[PDB]
């Protein structure tokens, strides 16, 4: 396959290899994020408004 100006391979290795074996595929990554949330903060008198 051609992309940009280069001429590069394109492969999937789930069927030829890794198929019907108890080893997982190593491109299924694991992103990591960390959430935070304030619990009981109380806003000042000026910004309490409908």
């Amino acid at each position: 396959v051609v992309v940009g100006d280069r001429l590069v391979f394109l492969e999937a290795l789930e069927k030829r290899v890794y198929q019907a074996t108890q080893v997982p595929y190593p491109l299924v990554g694991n992103l990591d994020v960390t959430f935070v949330m304030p619990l009981g903060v109380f806003k000042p008198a000026a910004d309490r408004y409908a």
Binding site: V17, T21, Q22, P24
Partner: protein, 148 residues
């Protein structure tokens, strides 16, 4: 007078689903089976993970049992006309014998053809039992070799 359209199971497109073979001895066989052997491939491991062994596994499936049937009754009032016991020597009775024979032939024509539609229906009947819904299948193949 109407006609009838014949249908043959080997001219349908569905026939390519199953392998059909005569077995004139099926009426004697007990619970019949077939055997399977599959060998799974194996990839080497590195460092921390332990070395894996090649695995074999045999497995056996079993036969089902079914049938098909029809009914083809004929009236006595013309049954007697067929055999020739009640047939008298006239001209107004042979005209009834011919009618009775034609009726019997037209009836066996329909009953014998019923077994082609019968198989064309039985195939769909069996196929509609094994097939799991796709909604519960596509998200099942994506986690294979992992539901340990």
């Amino acid at each position: 007078c109407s006609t009838l359209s014949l249908v043959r199971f080997l001219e349908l497109g569905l026939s390519v689903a199953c392998v059909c073979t005569k077995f004139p001895e099926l009426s004697y066989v007990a619970e019949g089976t077939i055997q399977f052997e599959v060998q799974q491939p194996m990839i080497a491991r590195d460092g921390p993970h332990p070395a894996d062994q090649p695995v074999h596994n045999y497995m056996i499936k079993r036969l089902d049992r079914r049938s098909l049937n029809a009914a083809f009754s004929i009236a006595v009032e013309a049954l007697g006309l067929i055999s020739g016991e009640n047939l008298d020597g006239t001209h107004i009775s042979s005209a009834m014998r011919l009618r009775a024979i034609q009726q019997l032939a037209r009836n066996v024509q329909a009953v014998l053809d019923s077994f082609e539609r019968g198989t064309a229906d039985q195939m769909l009947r069996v196929l509609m039992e094994k097939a799991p819904p796709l909604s519960l299948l596509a998200p099942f193949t994506l986690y294979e070799g992992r539901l340990a």
